Structures are given as C-alpha cells and as structure tokens.
Design a protein around this ligand. Structure first.
Ligand SMILES: CCCCC/C=C\C/C=C\CCCCCCCC(=O)O
Ligand SMILES: CCCCC/C=C\C/C=C\CCCCCCCC(=O)O
Ligand SMILES: CC(=O)N[C@@H]1[C@@H](O)[C@H](O)[C@@H](CO)O[C@H]1O
Ligand SMILES: CC(=O)N[C@@H]1[C@@H](O)[C@H](O)[C@@H](CO)O[C@H]1O
Ligand SMILES: CC(=O)N[C@@H]1[C@@H](O)[C@H](O)[C@@H](CO)O[C@H]1O
Ligand SMILES: CC(=O)N[C@@H]1[C@@H](O)[C@H](O)[C@@H](CO)O[C@H]1O
Ligand SMILES: CC(=O)N[C@@H]1[C@@H](O)[C@H](O)[C@@H](CO)O[C@H]1O
Ligand SMILES: CC(=O)N[C@@H]1[C@@H](O)[C@H](O)[C@@H](CO)O[C@H]1O
Ligand SMILES: *[C@@H]1O[C@H](CO)[C@@H](O)[C@H](O)[C@H]1NC(C)=O
Ligand SMILES: *[C@@H]1O[C@H](CO)[C@@H](O)[C@H](O)[C@H]1NC(C)=O
Lengths: 335, 411, 170, 48, 48
C-alpha cells in the first residue's frame, strides 16, 4: 500500500445540522473543530507526498521503441497498448479486482435515493472525500517511463544521464553480480528467455483466475468506509438526553430546558469526531512506513541490483518490474 | 459572511492570508416560506364538562375520561377559571399552543389541600401508596384548584372517601375498589370488626371553616404522548397551503424543521405517520388532509474551496464547487471564466493550453497560478520533459568525463 | 464547556458552594480533555521524530563511517563519502557523489572469435572506434588492446548471438 | 466523576429510578473514557 | 522485542458489573464498545 483516502468534515453540519440555536450554542467551544480539520489536512497533504516519493523518481518520460529487438524476452503484458487509461494487461487485471472523489450532484441524491446510497447520507452530514492530485493515467505513464528506462539503459538512468545497452549484455552483468560467469548466460539465452516468459504467463493466468490475492489493498478501502458509516450510525445515540433529534427537543422544550439536552449531544458528537481523527492519525503512520519501504524498493530493486537477502525477492536477485494498482504498487521480482 | 476569503480569514484568525487553497463551509440554501399542516377539526374540547362539572369522583375510585377530535384553546379558561397548581413534566407550557396530542386521557378526583404535593412521581404517602399513583416516566400535566364553596357543607360532607389500611402499595394507574376487612394482627378475620380488623375506607369532613390543608381541592391529571402517531387532537393554529420542491420551514402536527418536500412511492399502514431513517431522523410523512405520503430532503449539500494568491499581492480569488457540473445554478456568483474541471466547477480562473509545474494544487491533474494586467490561470500539470532512448541492437554509450557533486540532506 | 462563565472567581463570587460545584465540575472535565488531547498528539509526533532519528543514526553509520553501495541512500549518484553538520534539533549531511558527464557512442559485440574459440572480457566490455576493437571498463572510457590476459576462453564459436571476428594477442 | 459515590449499589440503595440516572450516566461516561484512553495508548504502543 | 501481551475487555462487566439497571442505560451507547474490541482484536491478530 502507498496511500489511503482523504477526507474533510464540516462540523456544524454533523453536530448541529441546519438549526441556528445549536450553531449559536456551539460557538462556546469554537477551537477544537479547527484543530480536527488541521489534523485531517495534514493527513491529506501527506497522502500526495507518499505518492510523489514512490512514483516520481525520474523526471524524463522515456518512450518505448517501435521494434523490440530484445534477445528473446517478451514484455507485451507489462508494457502498454495504445489501443485503450493507456494501462497494461496486468494493470487492467489488477484494477478489476479492487472495488472502489467524483461528482455527485444534488439532483441525484434528491428523493428516496438519499438515506439509501451510503454516500449521500454522508454528504448530507458534512463528510466529504477529496480527489487525489495524481490521476491513474499519470501514475501509469510514470510506471511506463520507469519500465522503459530499466529495459533500455539498465541502472545508469538512476545515477545521471541514461546510457543505452543491449538487454542480454545487461543480463550478463546482472549474472556476474550474483557469482555466475557470463558464458552461462550467452550459452543458455534461449532457455532462460523461455522460462521467463512461462513464469510471466503463469502470473497472468493466476491473476486472470478468480482468486483475489489483493487483500492488503482492499482492507484499506474497507476500513475507510467502515469508519465513516460507523460515524453516521453514531448519530442515533442520545448521550444521556431524552432524544437524539434536535427538532423533537425544540418542538417541546423552551430555550432554558433545551440547552441542558443539546449540550450533551454537542459533547458526545465532538468526542466521536475526536476519536475518528485520532484513529486516522494512527493509520496514516502505518501507510507512511509502507510508502517509505516502497520508495526504498523502487530505488534498490528497480534502479539497481540488490545484494541484500530476501529484500527484492526470495533468492539471488536479478531484477524487478513495477506496476500500479489502486492505492498501491506491485513488484514482479525476477530471481 | 461576505465572501469565502473573509470566512477563511476568520477561520485562521488573522487579517492576512498566505497563498494556497483552503476549505470553506458547504453550500447553504436558506428558506423562503413557512408551511403548517394540521388536520381539519372544527369543534372545541369539553373544557366545561371536565373543569366545571357538578360532581367529581373519589380518589380511590377515580374517573378517567377520553378526549378526541377537538381543538384545545385553553384561553377560554382565563375568564372564570383560577388554578392554584399547574405543573407540566415532559413538555414546556409555552409550546402547548403549537402541538398535536396523541392519546389524551383526563383523570379527575378530589382530595384535601395538604395532599396535593403527593400527586407527583416518587412521593411516598397515603395518596400515592393506596389510592392513586403516577409513573416515573410521566408525560402530561397536573392541575389543581380549591373548591371549599362547592364540596364543603355547613355540617360536614362525608361523600368523599380515601383508602386506608392496604396490604401493599399500588402500581401506576392501577385501581382498587375492593372492600374486604383488613387484618392488622395475625389472628384471622371473618367479616367482623374488632380491635385488629378495620374497614379500609374513611371519609374526609370538609367543613367550610376548616383550615387550609383540610379544605377540598379538585385535581385533574392530563396524560398524552407526542410526535409518534396520528394525534387526532390539535391546538389553535391556522394552516397554510403545501409548497413542494422548495426549501421551506414546516410544522407537521407539531414536528418542526426545514427542507424540500417531494412525492414518494412508499406505502404506509393505517397506524403510521412518520419515517424515522437509520439515524432516527424523519424522511417521510403523511399529510393529515390529503393523506398522501411526502419525502423530506435537506437543502444544504456541497463542498466549496477557495484559491488565493496572497493578500499582500492581490485580492482576486477563485472558487471551486466540488458537486456542480456547469455545462450551473448552485453557485454564489457566475463570473465569466468557467472551466468545469473534473474536480468541480472552477469559477474565477482562465484556462490555458500550456503545461507548467504545479504552484497551487487543485485536483485531478489541475493546478493554478498567478500569471501575466495579472490574473489567475488554471492548467494541466507537467510530468517531466518527455525523452527517448536510442536502443538499436548493438550500440552502447560510454562516458569520457565525470563530475564531483555535493548535495545536502536535512533530517 | 456549558457553564455560565470561564472564570472561577466570578462563579465563586456570585454562587454558593453547592451551586458552584455543578459549574466547576464541567470546567474540570473540559480542561482535562484538552490536556489528554495535547498528550495524545505529542505521543503521535514523538514516533515520527523517533523514526527520523533512527534513519539518521543509520545514515551516520553507513555513509560517514563507511561507503554505502545502496542506490539513492547517500546522495544522488555513485557515493564517495559524507560529512555531518549540526543544526538546531537536527542534522545535515553533505553527500559527495560521482556523476558521469560526457557520453560517446560505440558498437559492441561479446564473445570475440579468434580461431574456433570464444573470448570474453572478464572485466569490462568490447567496443569499436569504427575499424579497430578495444576492451574497456564500463564507467570511464579508457581503451586497451585485446590480449589473452584480459580475456578468458570458453567453448567454441557456434552458439553465441552477436559473436564477431578479430585478433587477440599475447 | 462528579457523582455522590463510585458504587452503583450505594446509589441504587438510596435514590430512585429518576434521581439515580444522573449519576450512573456520569459513571458510564467516565469509565468509557478510561477504556478509550487505555485502547488509544495500546494502539500507540503496538506500533513500536 | 518482538511481541506484547494480548488482551480483551467486557465493557458491560467493567462499567456496569452485575447490575441490570446500568446495562439498559448503556444500551443507549451500544456501539462504542464494539469499536474498542475491534481495535484490540486487530492488535492481538498482529502480535502473532
Ligand atoms: C379537555 C382537556 C384538553 C387537553 C388538551 C391537551 C393539552 C392542554 C394543556 C393544558 C390545558 C390547561 C392549561 C391551563 C390554562 C392556563 C392556566 C390559567 O387558566 O390561567
Ligand atoms: C421519630 C424519629 C424516627 C426517625 C426514623 C428515621 C427516618 C424516618 C424518615 C421519615 C419519617 C417521616 C414520616 C413521614 C410520613 C409520610 C407523610 C404522611 O403521609 O404523613
Ligand atoms: C514477438 C512477440 O512479442 N510474441 C508474443 C506472442 O508469442 C505471445 O503470444 C503474446 C502473448 O502476450 O505476446 C507477444
Ligand atoms: C525449456 C525447455 O526446453 N525444457 C525441456 C523440455 O521442453 C523437454 O520436454 C524436456 C525433455 O528433454 O527437457 C527440457
Ligand atoms: C402490586 C400489587 O398491588 N399487586 C397485587 C398483589 O398485592 C396481590 O397479591 C395480587 C394477587 O394476589 O394482585 C396484585
Ligand atoms: C365503585 C363503587 O362505587 N363501588 C361499589 C359500591 O358503590 C357498592 O356499594 C358495592 C356493593 O355493590 O359495590 C362496589
Ligand atoms: C464531469 C462530468 O460530470 N461530465 C459529464 C459529461 O460526461 C456529460 O457529457 C455532460 C452532459 O450529459 O454532463 C457532465
Ligand atoms: C550520445 C549520442 O550522441 N547519441 C546519438 C543519439 O543522439 C542519436 O539519436 C542516435 C541516432 O540513432 O545516434 C546516437
Ligand atoms: C365553565 O363554567 C363557567 C361558569 O362558572 C363558565 O363561565 C365557563 O365559560 C365554563 N368554561 C369554559 C371554558 O367555557
Ligand atoms: C572534463 O571536464 C572538465 C570540466 O568539468 C574539463 O575542464 C576537462 O577539459 C574535461 N576533460 C576532457 C578530457 O575533456
């Protein structure tokens, strides 16, 4: 995982609603809502740096040559197809495995659709989601640039200008790095290429089957939805008062008897929001750690050749390839 | 409240604002009319038969009347009725003129003065233990007034009774008209009264010279519920017409609020009147005249942001409406430079065709800056200067020189 | 916090003990909550600071007290050394790196073929200036002449794809 | 927590249905906040 | 260090005890405890 969901909260709409009495009573705190929104804004701003650090390693969008001219290898499934979101085959497969800020007009949620869609019921209570600054197409273009630099220049494109070198003359280097001489590669090139192709084909066939394999990216979405729906449900709690509806309190009680009951709800819902923000602050840290690990793998495993054990895959490392998924990244490690 | 810039100034609590993009309050719509819908009732309530009767009941055999299909304009009591005690528990007295009541019952009886304090929840006396008791969740109103000129005679009135000598305390609203000899000791009783066997009823005296505390008082307890069911009873409020598809304040049978009223396909049952969504909020109601079903929808819905270059260089701004497709009405102003990005409708900035780096991030690949007369421009962000590599089949590039760099890292 | 004032001396100057305890309890609760929030936020920030401190302690060991081989860990380019400097509540590293400057193009082929036997460079790659054939290192063009000391032999010339023909000396 | 006691059996032995709610509510609020603090600090400890 | 101690909490037993009046009043919250136990269960599953 590389990122989570950004959110914003209008607290006057969640706590008080459209009543003016509650909104006048709520000025007596006035200092905690700005704090909550400060925290959430910090989170939201961190969530785009977490992506700029992973995917924007290079600032030269290298293009792919028309005729491959490779030694027998096949990157048709990882490289794009301009026909199509100019993604790749496996990337498309990935996006169709993880379910789920776009425009939702007031004319759509107007009617019975409201209170029945789970996204209109939030917006009607001050909770909104924000679109990320980098679109999926940009991320895929970055990934394609990285792939095309790896495939045509080895690792030199991560230490300065990009120098070109044939793919087999690069795998010979990557061989000498683990302890095997060159002749081993130049004398079994065809077989090695066939094995690589069959391995990637098995990858494609296992990802084209009906097993998820992407739970680490789905649990993020699930948690982020469960939190907001729990928050919406928490509005049916009385918190020690006679009712959870302000209009019922205001249709039967005067200005004096009603404050005793509205302050309870104010306090309760403010505490609810505090808890939400605390838990989000605690999860953002896990996401940041994972993003820093991914940014270290993109530089030690994609832009070079690692000598660390079990870091860039299980075995003697040869190379790795990146692919973009929803809220995260996938590495194919060749060992 | 003049504009979003002033709102963010008051938020940051400063008269200067640094450049960037800020989140503001959501788009609010204010009402224009007021709607009231009560049932169609013509007759008045029996205030006379109740408050101005000729014979009241006894506290042990108290009477309970029902009230239905009437209008409660208690102002008619201001002429000749004078109440010594009036206490409401689940409702305020200043709102009895704007509500409608569900299941109204009226309990009536007569006691002595110094027992009126016992008509309340949790009082532990002779009238609350053996004769008449009230729940602990009582919603209603208690009324009491002196009657020393009607219920008192010049030689003693012994037609009002109270129950002494019961074996166990009563329960809420439960009656008892049994007359069975009460046994004090453990020796048995066989319907005869002596030295341990007492008749469990006794009568007040109610003379006209007896002192306050021995003078008769008439009491009336009114019990009802509120805001859950049809409520055929209502107060003195004149209704209006029905305004659909507009933000209005409404009062449906005592339930207030503000929203947009729309037709529904839902079908209720003859014993239902409200909708009560997951969060216990109403999202449907039955009009008490046309008997049709109506939905209820809030008027406020949105999400609004403000783009600013800085209050020390310019005072022009741009505004982003996240839930509007201006390709147009849910806006504060219309301006003349609409763009309609994928993150919302941007109003206040001129769209260009070039591609620079991001200065102020907006969303979905769009950015904003202060370009050259100076204005605000919005554009699509750049990704880093497209390049290509010359991989033929058999060519290699080798360097012939180097450089020694020195970079910094702060931690 | 739902009380008549935020000053205890106005509460205690107008109200008795019983009426005032009701109002002081609310202030106590609210201020306690404020302090709890403060401490929670400081506990969450100390974690970030600790992670950064541990990373700096790792960089001191791997970049200053030694020469790292990881990519983009100490600098941008081929690492050489580093130097620390102290700053308020932090540290600053001056990373020294090697960066190639001037590229030149050549044609290349592996497994040179002298006479039925293939030869590989054993360190570096083969290049040609158009007519001649040299062997050189990878990150600094310094050509040498091809002998039997800077190469080794393996098998015969019937498999390799790209093999060329030239002379190797001794 | 601002109540007359910290024992529900000493409260429910003197006060009735309605006079006892205002105290049990305080105790509930306080003990719930205690549990919340415990869980928050354990969440912060588990990350180290 | 590699792990810590796993825990679980019964909120009705900590807050209300054996009383049946506090439980009915606590039902008016009913959803702040499940959150606690969800968090603690996450911790426990992570420690293994
Ligand atoms: C026949 C009973 C109808 C009950 C209707 C329901 C609620 C009405 C509530 C209170 C009515 C009595 C108010 C007393 C008048 C004010 C005191 C006075 O006189 O100065
Ligand atoms: C003689 C001293 C005994 C003290 C015993 C201790 C506590 C007793 C508490 C209250 C006793 C008061 C009796 C009031 C009778 C109910 C009112 C009535 O209907 O008349
Ligand atoms: C020259 C070349 O690229 N051939 C392969 C082709 O054999 C294979 O069937 C296809 C599957 O992805 O990809 C391509
Ligand atoms: C990559 C490859 O060619 N593997 C071959 C396999 O196809 C063949 O069936 C087997 C029989 O000798 O030997 C090995
Ligand atoms: C609370 C109350 O009044 N309960 C009475 C109880 O005294 C009596 O025993 C029962 C029948 O035996 O009828 C009922
Ligand atoms: C409610 C009531 O008045 N109680 C009656 C009483 O009048 C009558 O004397 C008795 C004998 O029939 O039955 C009972
Ligand atoms: C961002 C967005 O919502 N765009 C749609 C657009 O696709 C459509 O063509 C137009 C007319 O229906 O309404 C709007
Ligand atoms: C470093 C250098 O000069 N490389 C050139 C490249 O610019 C050119 O595009 C190519 C043509 O095939 O020949 C080589
Ligand atoms: C009840 O009777 C009195 C006569 O004493 C009368 O004046 C009064 O109008 C009656 N009450 C009402 C509400 O009319
Ligand atoms: C290498 O670069 C330096 C400047 O960085 C230059 O002065 C020198 O002439 C160059 N050497 C060659 C061989 O061109």
């Amino acid at each position: 995982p590389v990122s989570m969901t950004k959110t914003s909260v209008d607290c006057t709409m969640y706590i008080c609603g459209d009543s003016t009495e509650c909104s006048n009573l709520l000025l007596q705190y006035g200092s905690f809502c700005t704090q909550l929104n400060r925290a959430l804004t910090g989170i939201a701003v961190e969530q785009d740096k977490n992506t700029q650090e992973v995917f924007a390693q290079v600032k030269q969008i290298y293009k792919t040559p028309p005729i491959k001219d490779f030694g027998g290898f096949n990157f048709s499934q990882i490289l794009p197809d301009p026909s199509k979101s100019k993604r790749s085959f496996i990337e498309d497969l990935l996006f169709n495995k993880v379910t789920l800020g776009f425009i939702k007009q007031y004319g759509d949620c107007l009617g019975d659709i409201a209170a029945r869609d789970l996204i209109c019921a939030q917006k009607f209570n001050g909770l909104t989601v924000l679109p990320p600054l980098l679109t999926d197409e940009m991320i895929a273009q970055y990934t394609s640039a990285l792939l095309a630099g790896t495939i045509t220049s080895g690792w030199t494109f991560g230490a300065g200008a990009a120098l070109q070198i044939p793919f087999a003359m690069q795998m010979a280097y990557r061989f000498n790095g683990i302890g095997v001489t060159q002749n081993v590669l130049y004398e079994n090139q065809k077989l090695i290429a066939n094995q690589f192709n069959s391995a990637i084909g098995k990858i494609q066939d296992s990802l084209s089957s009906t097993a998820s394999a992407l739970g680490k990216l789905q649990d993020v979405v699930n948690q982020n939805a469960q939190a907001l729906n729990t928050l919406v449900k928490q509005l049916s709690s009385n918190f020690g008062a006679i009712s959870s509806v302000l209009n019922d309190i205001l249709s039967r009680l005067d200005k004096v008897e009603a404050e005793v009951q509205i302050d309870r709800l104010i306090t309760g819902r403010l505490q609810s929001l505090q808890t939400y923000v605390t838990q989000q602050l605690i999860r953002a840290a896990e996401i940041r750690a994972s993003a820093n690990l991914a940014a270290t793998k993109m530089s030690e495993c994609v832009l070079g050749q690692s000598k660390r054990v079990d870091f860039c895959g299980k075995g003697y490392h040869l190379m790795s390839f990146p692919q973009s998924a929803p809220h995260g990244v996938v590495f194919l490690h060749v060992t | 409240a003049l504009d979003p810039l002033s709102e963010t100034k008051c938020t940051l609590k400063s008269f200067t604002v640094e450049k960037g993009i800020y989140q503001t309050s959501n788009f609010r719509v204010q009402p224009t009319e007021s709607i009231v819908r009560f049932p169609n009732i013509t007759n008045l309530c029996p205030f006379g038969e109740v408050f101005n009767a000729t014979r009241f009941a006894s506290v042990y055999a108290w009477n309970r009347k029902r009230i239905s299909n009437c209008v409660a304009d208690y102002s008619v009591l201001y002429n000749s009725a004078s109440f010594s005690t009036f206490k409401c528990y689940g409702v305020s007295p200043t709102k009895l003129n704007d509500l409608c009541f569900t299941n109204v019952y009226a309990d009536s009886f007569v006691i002595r003065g110094d027992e009126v304090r016992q008509i309340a929840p949790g009082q532990t006396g002779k009238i609350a233990d053996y004769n008449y008791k009230l729940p602990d969740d009582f919603t209603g109103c208690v009324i009491a007034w002196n009657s020393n000129n009607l219920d008192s005679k010049v030689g003693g009135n012994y037609n009002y009774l109270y129950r002494l000598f019961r074996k166990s305390n009563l329960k809420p609203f439960e009656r008892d008209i049994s007359t069975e000899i009460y046994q004090a000791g453990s020796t048995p009783c066989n319907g005869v009264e002596g030295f341990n066997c007492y008749f469990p009823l006794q009568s007040y005296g109610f003379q006209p010279t007896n002192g306050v505390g021995y003078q008769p008082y008439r009491v009336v307890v009114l019990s009802f519920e509120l805001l859950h069911a049809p409520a055929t009873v209502c107060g003195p409020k004149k209704s209006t017409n029905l305004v659909k598809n507009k933000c209005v304040n409404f009062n449906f049978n005592g339930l207030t609020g503000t929203g947009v009223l729309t037709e529904s396909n839902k079908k209720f049952l003859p014993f239902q009147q409200f909708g009560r969504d997951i969060a216990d909020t109403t999202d449907a109601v039955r009009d008490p005249q046309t008997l049709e079903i109506l939905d209820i929808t809030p008027c406020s819905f949105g999400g609004v942001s403000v783009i600013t270059p800085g209050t020390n260089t310019s005072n022009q701004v741009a505004v982003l409406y996240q839930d509007v497709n201006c390709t147009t009405w849910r806006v504060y102003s219309t301006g003349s430079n609409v763009f309609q990005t994928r993150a919302g409708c941007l109003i206040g900035a001129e769209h260009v065709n070039n591609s620079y780096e991001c200065d102020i991030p907006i969303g979905a690949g769009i950015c904003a800056s202060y370009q050259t007369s100076q204005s605000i421009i919005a554009y699509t962000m750049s990704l880093g200067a497209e390049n290509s590599v010359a991989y033929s089949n058999n060519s290699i590039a080798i360097p012939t020189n180097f450089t020694i760099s020195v970079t910094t890292e702060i931690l | 916090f739902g009380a008549i004032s935020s000053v205890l001396n106005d509460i205690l100057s107008r109200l008795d003990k019983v009426e005032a305890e009701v109002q002081i309890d609310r202030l106590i609760t609210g201020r306690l909550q404020s302090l709890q929030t403060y401490v929670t936020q400081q506990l969450i920030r100390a974690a970030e600071i600790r992670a950064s401190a541990n990373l700096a302690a790792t960089k001191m060991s791997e970049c200053v007290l030694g020469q790292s081989k990881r990519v983009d860990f100490c600098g941008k380019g081929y690492h050489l050394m580093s130097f620390p400097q102290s700053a308020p509540h932090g540290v600053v590293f001056l990373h020294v790196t090697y960066v190639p400057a001037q590229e030149k193009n050549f044609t290349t082929a592996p497994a040179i073929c002298h006479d039925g036997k293939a030869h590989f460079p054993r360190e570096g790659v083969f290049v040609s200036n158009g007519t001649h054939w040299f062997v050189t290192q990878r990150n600094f063009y310094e050509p040498q002449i091809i002998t039997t000391d800077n190469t080794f032999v393996s098998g015969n010339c019937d498999v390799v794809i790209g093999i060329v023909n030239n002379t190797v000396y001794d």
